[PDB]
Amino acid sequence: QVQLVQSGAEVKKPGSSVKVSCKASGGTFSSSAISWVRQAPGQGLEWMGGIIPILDITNYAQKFQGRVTITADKSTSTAFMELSSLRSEDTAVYYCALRNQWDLLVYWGQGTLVTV
Amino acid sequence: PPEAEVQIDRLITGRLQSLQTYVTQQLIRAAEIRASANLAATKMSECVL
Amino acid sequence: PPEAEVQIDRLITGRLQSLQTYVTQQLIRAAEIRASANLAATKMSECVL
Amino acid sequence: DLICAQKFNGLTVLPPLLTDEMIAQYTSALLAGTICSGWT
Amino acid sequence: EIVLTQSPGTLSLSPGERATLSCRASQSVSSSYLAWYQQKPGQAPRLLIYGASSRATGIPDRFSGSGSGTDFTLTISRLEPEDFAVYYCQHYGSSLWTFGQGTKLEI
Amino acid sequence: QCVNLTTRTQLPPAYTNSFTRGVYYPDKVFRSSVLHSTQDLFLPFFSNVTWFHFDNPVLPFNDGVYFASTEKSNIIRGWIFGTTLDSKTQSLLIVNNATNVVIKVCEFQFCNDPFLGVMESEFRVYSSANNCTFEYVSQPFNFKNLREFVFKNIDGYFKIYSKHTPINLVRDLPQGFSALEPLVDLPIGINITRFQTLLALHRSSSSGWTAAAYYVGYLQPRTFLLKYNENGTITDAVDCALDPL
Amino acid sequence: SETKCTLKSFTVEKGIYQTSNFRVQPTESIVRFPNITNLCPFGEVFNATRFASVYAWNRKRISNCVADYSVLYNSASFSTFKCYGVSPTKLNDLCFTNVYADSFVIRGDEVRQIAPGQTGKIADYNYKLPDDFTGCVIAWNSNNLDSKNYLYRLFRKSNLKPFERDISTEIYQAGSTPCNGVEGFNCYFPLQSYGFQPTNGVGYQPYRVVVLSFELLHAPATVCGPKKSTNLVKNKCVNFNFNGLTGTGVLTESNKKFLPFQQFGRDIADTTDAVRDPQTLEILDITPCSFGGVSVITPGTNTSNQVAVLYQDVNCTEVSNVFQTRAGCLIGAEHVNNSYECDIPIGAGICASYQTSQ
Amino acid sequence: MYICGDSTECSNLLLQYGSFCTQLNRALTGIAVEQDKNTQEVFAQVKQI
Ligand SMILES: *[C@@H]1O[C@H](CO)[C@@H](O[C@@H]2O[C@H](CO)[C@@H](O)[C@H](O)[C@H]2NC(C)=O)[C@H](O)[C@H]1NC(C)=O
Ligand SMILES: *[C@@H]1O[C@H](CO)[C@@H](O)[C@H](O)[C@H]1NC(C)=O
Ligand SMILES: *[C@@H]1O[C@H](CO)[C@@H](O)[C@H](O)[C@H]1NC(C)=O
Ligand SMILES: *[C@@H]1O[C@H](CO)[C@@H](O)[C@H](O)[C@H]1NC(C)=O
Ligand SMILES: *[C@@H]1O[C@H](CO)[C@@H](O)[C@H](O)[C@H]1NC(C)=O
Ligand SMILES: *[C@@H]1O[C@H](CO)[C@@H](O)[C@H](O)[C@H]1NC(C)=O
């Protein structure tokens, strides 16, 4: 039922920000939680942070405490993550993932490559 | 239990209505006898004394 | 709605009975007072005037 | 306050037509009448 | 935080053999929040096991697992060539996520 | 860990008058300038209360316990509540050990004399512990201090009401009226049939086995009319089953 | 016209008639809830890989979270969704304490026993639901998960109390034989397994059952629905929703000494008098808007159609020719510096009449 | 208001009954009228002041 749809790949210059868009298909944007996970080339996954769109609450990984702002648009069922002050160190695939309350499954988007 | 509660409540309502009816009649009748007693008291005072 | 209607009707029946009881007693008390007032009026007419 | 609690549940009290002052005036008139002219 | 460590970091096994991957938590975790994933280069992680059991919809059914406390295992009953992959366990604590160690499986 | 010592002064139980103590605020509702009819478990007025004084026997919990203690010595630190207290079932240990107030519910095996010493040279209490359902830890810290408590256990919720007042006590509890405000409601889910207090043995420990007292009563499902003053404080009460008056 | 309708007449006699009321309306609604940061952990309840046998049914406490019940209700995966004491639609906007989710596996023919007042081997020996119950019984077919294990109590000395979980498995006397253990003849082991197989008929297919038990409107709330709060507007007629409590009235600051553990106040009628606001712990009083009560002073209709209206208990500051009297505000009458014989009585020394340009 | 505390649903259910409220209102109105009459009969016997 649940589908996560992400925006395409981008190329950035140092110091710029990247805003990744994740649309929640299948509904239940509210009463669910959305997190963002990064995968630098050659690395495993790491948590960046997330948001609960219904409760208007954000939460961040210590590694990413600051620089990144996570928001959610209830009207368009879309979550966003904007990571500022980019460096070549941030080349990674940025993934959107979510879980509904009442469920156990974690649904994933495609992952978008952002280079700097 | 719940089957009995329905039947028990029906009897309670019917019996309460009976008591209320009884009391109302006694109150009305009591007013009547009081009026008689007041007359009797008047006669005692005026014709005996 | 339909479940509330059942519960509401239970409360309405009880409240109707409460008001009806009140009024009946209030009427009986009023009758007693009229008798007292009539007596008072008689006393004034015969003993004051 | 109890009168308010009763009011809020639809129970109210109406004023009397005659006030205490009006009653006092009737009483005084009767007394004046009696003292001045007896039962006449 | 609670750190998950898997073992062996790398391993070479033959198709047709049984294989297991361990996942140890530095602190006890609820089994209900643990999951295993499979990854191939260029692909998003695929869920296999959740709630430390509960095979995922569409799974090959060659995969199963169990655990409690601090010790959990992913079992592949028979390896097929398609099962040689990076595998990891993660904890979905919902306020805390834990990732790391791919116990990379090769032929 | 645990001390297999007897060597106690052998005393009978003493008894006292509960007077008019034992009212609890039964609700979270503000009422004022009213007299309200409440049926709950309350200490009966003028009940026969058992007086204890290093006296720490296992007592029945029954339907709830009215507990009061008097000291200046800081000996009474807490309570142990449960059934068998031998790791077969869970039990509740509430202790003020100065370092923290520690509340635990676990399948604990306890010492037959689960005490604390005094500084604090030792803490004994336990022999073992299984996986524990509940834990809470608070932050670190003629008789003069009276503390009144009631311990209720309703549908798994251990409910404690309490009050702390100044005294000048040489024997029994003062006569007067009090009502206890709720302190805590613990969502535990356990069976309590017996309990002990937790005392801190003075130490300068048989070689130094060294001044506090407490009272135990029980609650009954009586109806009281509780008098609320203008500030919503219960100031008085009528025990509707004490006598014809 | 109001007088004509109450009297069922097209003609009205001289005098005073009692009609209608004075019902000041709310202009906006207010919603106030505690700010809860968690979503409720129900994946563990409904989507669990293992359920208990009924015999040793599980009980999970839910607290300090937001729960959207729209999802469970709308989901088509359930074979049954029966609520007692609450409409599933209304459930979503209520706030609770002590919410518990009981769970277990049953045979399909046992679905009818998970109910407040039903009897049978489950209802009496494995899981008794109270006759007095508020909550929802939700269940679905699990044949594809559980069938290939589970034991049920068939032989018990006595019936269970609501929400009792008695799991002793000791073998005991049923009949005449003075034994325990020694299974056989007239001593039996209390439970029987009912393994689930893909070949079982539907009455013997397993079902996963979750029972949601709630304590509604306990003064606190820990489990609360997905409802946003609004600003708190004072000194106006509003609708209200204080942690699930509703009503209409004018709310004001209240100088009441609520104790630290108190959060509602009550009237003699046991209606809400006051609340403690869920976000700012301020005490607020709730006072109903206005009652008025209106009587109409009418010259007979065979003379004229002018009427005067008396608002029985109002100030002439609220509602040309307005007279404030002890009996209320009389509107439309012309007060004069005179006196006359009483005609239509009003009260408190005042009467009225129709007289001259009348 | 006594029975249906500003509930539309209650009012509509109340209307399934007969003219209950009307009778109660008449009874209480009648009493109130008598109370003023009683006062006048007792005190206003002489209209000369
Ligand atoms: C956890 O929840 C998911 C989502 O409702 C369940 O997945 C569905 O299972 C049925 C039955 O096999 C399939 O027909 C659906 O297509 C699945 N939906 C999705 C989105 O995958 C899953 O079975 C639940 N797990 C447990 C243990 O209850
Ligand atoms: C000695 O202590 C142990 C541990 O509490 C207890 O089980 C045992 O019964 C005690 N024995 C005596 C004689 O006090
Ligand atoms: C509590 O313990 C007593 C004594 O063993 C037992 O009879 C009773 O059933 C127990 N109650 C509960 C809820 O376990
Ligand atoms: C969050 O809750 C606290 C405590 O009730 C309150 O003081 C604060 O204003 C709330 N914040 C909101 C509603 O943004
Ligand atoms: C308003 O009501 C008060 C009593 O609360 C009264 O004293 C005052 O005269 C009234 N006022 C008007 C019509 O201004
Ligand atoms: C009526 O009485 C008021 C109050 O004393 C006074 O102001 C007004 O002038 C009077 N009117 C007449 C016509 O006497």
Task: Give Dmax (Cα) for chain C.
Answer: 68
Surface-to-core class of residue G69, CB atoms within 10 Å of its CB (0-12 exposed, 13-18 middle, 19+ buried): buried
Ligand 2 binding pocket includes F3 (Cβ within 6 Å): no
Q: What H or E segment, with its residue span, contains residue H26?
A: helix H20-43
Ligand 3, atom 14: nearest CA belongs to which residue? F191
Q: Do the Cβ atoms of G348 and D5 come within 8 Å?
A: no
Q: Beta strands of chain A (E only): which ranges?
A: 3-6, 10-11, 18-25, 32-39, 46-52, 57-60, 68-73, 78-83, 92-100, 107-108, 112-115
Nearest bound ligand to the CA of residue G324: 5
Cα–Cα distance list, G194 to E58, G88, G200 (Å)? 30, 33, 10
Q: How far apart are CA F120 and CA G274, in angstroms?
A: 48
Full strand arrangement of the beta sheet holding F220-228:
F34-42, F220-228, F234-239
Ligand 1 binding pocket includes A105 (Cβ within 6 Å): yes
**Residues G255-264, buried b or exposed e (16+ Cβ, 10 A)?**
ebebeeebbb
Search chain C and give the residue with CA nearest B26.
Answer: C28
Q: Do the Cβ atoms of A103 and G43 come within 8 Å?
A: yes
Length reported for chain A: 116
Nearest bound ligand to the CA of residue F110: 2
Beta pairing, strands F65-71 & G308-311: unpaired
C-alpha G315 to ligand 5 mean position (Å)? 6
Q: What H or E segment, with its residue span, contains residue G83?
A: strand G80-84
What is the CATH classification number for the domain harbouring A33? 2.60.40.10
Chain B residue numbers touching G117 (CB-CB < 8 A): 1-2
Q: Using alpha carbons only, what angle is made at residue G171 by residues G170 and G174, rounded to the nearest 5 degrees?
A: 130
Q: How far apart are CA G284 and CA G287, in angstroms?
A: 10
Chains G and D touch (3+ CB pairs under 8 A): yes
Q: How far apart are CA G335 and CA G355, in angstroms?
A: 12
Q: How far apart are CA F71 and CA F52, in angstroms?
A: 12
Q: Do the Cβ atoms of C26 and H35 come within 8 Å?
A: no
Q: Do the Cβ atoms of H2 and C16 come within 8 Å?
A: no
Q: Is F183 left (phi over 0), alpha (psi -120 to 50) or beta?
A: alpha
Tokens at A48, concatenated: 């960046």
Chain breaks of chain E after residues with C–N above 2.5 Å: none
Nearest residue, CB atoms, H13 vs list C9, C40, C44 = C9
| B vs G: CB pairs below 8 A | 4
- For residues G86 and G138, the answer to whether their CB atoms sit within 8 Å is no
Give residue A40's domain range: 3-114
Ligand 4, closest atom to CA G279? 5
Counting ligand 5 atoms within 8 A of each CB, the residue from G290, G315, G316, G326 with the most, and so the one to mutate, is G315
Beta pairing, strands A10-11 & A112-115: parallel
Tokens at E90, concatenated: 């993660």
Chain G residue numbers touching B4 (CB-CB < 8 A): none
Q: Show which subunits contact C, needing at least 3 CB pairs below 8 angstroms.
A: B, D, H
C-alpha E47 to ligand 1 mean position (Å)? 13
Q: Let me know how many helices (H) and strands (E) chain C has, helices first.
A: 1, 0
Tokens at G9, concatenated: 């007449």
C-alpha F2 to ligand 1 mean position (Å)? 54
C-alpha G144 to ligand 1 mean position (Å)? 11
Going by C-beta distance under 8 Å and a sequence separation of 6 or more, which residues neighbour residue A49?
A: A35, A36, A58, A59, A60, A61, A64, A68, A70, A81
* Reported resolution, Å: 3.3
φ and ψ of A29, to 5 deg: -70, -45
Q: What is the DSSP string of E54-82?
A: EEPTT--S-EEEEEETTEEEEEESS--GG
Search chain D and give the residue with CA nearest H46.
Answer: D30
φ and ψ of E7, to 5 deg: -155, 145
Chain breaks of chain A after residues with C–N above 2.5 Å: none
Which one, of G164, G191, G159, G185, lies nearest residue G173 by Cα? G185
Chain A residue numbers touching E101 (CB-CB < 8 A): 44
Ligand 4 binding pocket includes G279 (Cβ within 6 Å): yes
Q: Do the Cβ atoms of G259 and F181 come within 8 Å?
A: yes
Ligand 1 binding pocket includes A62 (Cβ within 6 Å): no
Tokens at A20, concatenated: 């990744």
Domains and CATH numbers, chain F: 14-245 (2.60.120.960)
- For residues F191 and F61, the answer to whether their CB atoms sit within 8 Å is no
**Solved by what technique?**
cryo-EM
Is H48 touching D (CB cutoff 8 A)? yes
Ligand 1 binding pocket includes A103 (Cβ within 6 Å): yes
Cβ atoms < 10 Å from Cβ of F197: 22
Q: Hey, what's the torsion of the CAs at F83, F84, F90, F93, to 10 degrees? A: 80
Q: Show which subunits contact H, needing at least 3 CB pairs below 8 angstroms.
A: C, D, G
C-alpha G19 to ligand 3 mean position (Å)? 64
Chain E residue numbers touching G77 (CB-CB < 8 A): none
Per-state percent for chain E, helix, strand, coil, to nearest 5: 5, 50, 45
Q: How far apart are CA G24 and CA G288, in angstroms?
A: 9
Q: Do the Cβ atoms of D8 and G288 come within 8 Å?
A: yes
Chain G residue numbers touching D2 (CB-CB < 8 A): 268
Ligand 2 binding pocket includes F14 (Cβ within 6 Å): no
Q: How far apart are CA E7 and CA E17, in angstroms?
A: 18
Which of A102, A104, A105 has the highest number of chain G CBs within 10 A, making it the mutation to test binding with G?
A: A102
Search chain H and give the residue with CA nearest D25.
Answer: H49
Which one, of G143, G122, G118, G116, lies nearest residue G54 by Cα? G122
Ligand 1 binding pocket includes E53 (Cβ within 6 Å): no
Is G49 touching E (CB cutoff 8 A)? yes
Q: Do the Cβ atoms of A32 and G40 come within 8 Å?
A: no
Chains B and E touch (3+ CB pairs under 8 A): no
Ligand 1, closest atom to CA G47? 28
Is G198 touching A (CB cutoff 8 A)? no
Which residue type sits at G296? V
Ligand 1 binding pocket includes E95 (Cβ within 6 Å): no
Chain B residue numbers touching C40 (CB-CB < 8 A): none
Q: Which position has the token pair 């596996």?
A: G105
Per-state percent for chain B, helix, strand, coil, to nearest 5: 95, 0, 5
Give the total number of structural domains in chain A: 1
Q: Do the Cβ atoms of H48 and D27 come within 8 Å?
A: no
Chain G residue numbers touching A33 (CB-CB < 8 A): 39
Beta pairing, strands F101-110 & F126-137: antiparallel
Beta pairing, strands F157-169 & F34-42: unpaired
Ligand 1, atom 22: nearest CA belongs to which residue? G47
Cβ atoms < 10 Å from Cβ of A28: 22
Q: In 3-state terms, what secondary structure has residue G281?
A: coil
Search chain C and give the residue with CA nearest B20.
Answer: C21
C-alpha G336 to ligand 6 mean position (Å)? 8
Ligand 4, atom 6: nearest CA belongs to which residue? G279
Q: For residue G184, give the DSSP letter.
A: B
Q: Where are the domains of chain E?
A: 4-105
Q: Do the Cβ atoms of H46 and C44 come within 8 Å?
A: no
Cβ atoms < 10 Å from Cβ of A37: 25
How far is Cα of residue E98 from the mean position of the Cα atoms in its chain?
A: 13
Which one, of F151, F131, F133, lies nearest residue F192 by Cα? F151
Ligand 5 binding pocket includes G27 (Cβ within 6 Å): no
Q: Which CATH architecture has domain E4-105?
A: Sandwich (2.60)
